[PDB]
Every structure is written in structure tokens, then in C-alpha cells.
Amino acid sequence: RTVVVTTIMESPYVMYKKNHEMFEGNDKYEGYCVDLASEIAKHIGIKYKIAIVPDGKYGARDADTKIWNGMVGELVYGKAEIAIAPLTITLVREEV
């Protein structure tokens, strides 16, 4: 199975290549986290697809609705298999 990776467009971690209109799939993107994802996949033995989180957020729990947004939410609610991004380890995220 193809592993679904959630990430976020922020330089220099993940950036769309200048010529991305001529490219397909993962090769549309470049950056530190793109290179890291490739190294992790090679060491762990999986194929993967880079997807960009829809709401453009890292991950916080709404005070009113208690719903997690961002990349954290994509993992919590079962929509993605892994997040490879500039995502800070914090107490409230480690809890979920």
C-alpha cells in the first residue's frame, strides 16, 4: 500500500518546483522535508505520496469544537499515515 504523507508548503521544507507544470506526483516538489521523506521511505521500505494539508495548519485543538485541525488532525482522524514537516513536538500534540 502507498503511504499517505501529509505536509505543508513552507520554504525550504517543501516548495513547488518552478517547472512543476511539466512534472508529476512527488517530483513536483523539492526541499528539506522532500529529501527527508525519501530517505525515511528508503530505510523503512515503503512507497509514498506527498499530499498538502488542506487547511494549511500545523495542528491545534479548537477551544469550542474540540476538533484538531492541520496535519495533526489528519493523523488523529485517520486521513493520513504520517506527517513529515516542520512540526514541533509539544505536550498537547504528544498526548494525541
Partner 1 sequence: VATPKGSSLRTPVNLAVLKLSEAGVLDKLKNKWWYDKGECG
Ligand X SMILES: NS(=O)(=O)c1cccc2c1c([N+](=O)[O-])cc1[nH]c(=O)c(=O)[nH]c12
Which residues define the annotated binding site? 86, 88, 93
State the minimum distance, in angstroms, from the CB of residue 33 to partner 1. 9
Q: How far apart are CA 69 and CA 67, in angstroms?
A: 6
DSSP 3-state assignment of 52? strand
Q: Which residues bind partner 1 (CB under 8 A)?
A: 3, 12, 31-32, 35-36, 39-40, 43-44, 46, 71-72, 75-76, 78, 80-84, 87, 93, 96
Q: How far apart are CA 83 and CA 18, in angstroms?
A: 24
3-32 positions binding ligand X, by CB under 6 A: 10
For cell 489528519, name the residue: 74
**For residues 20 and 36, which CB has a smaller minimum distance to partner 1 in the complex?**
36
For cell 495548519, name the residue: 57
From 12, 54, 56, 86, residue interacting with ligand X (rule: CB under 6 A):
86
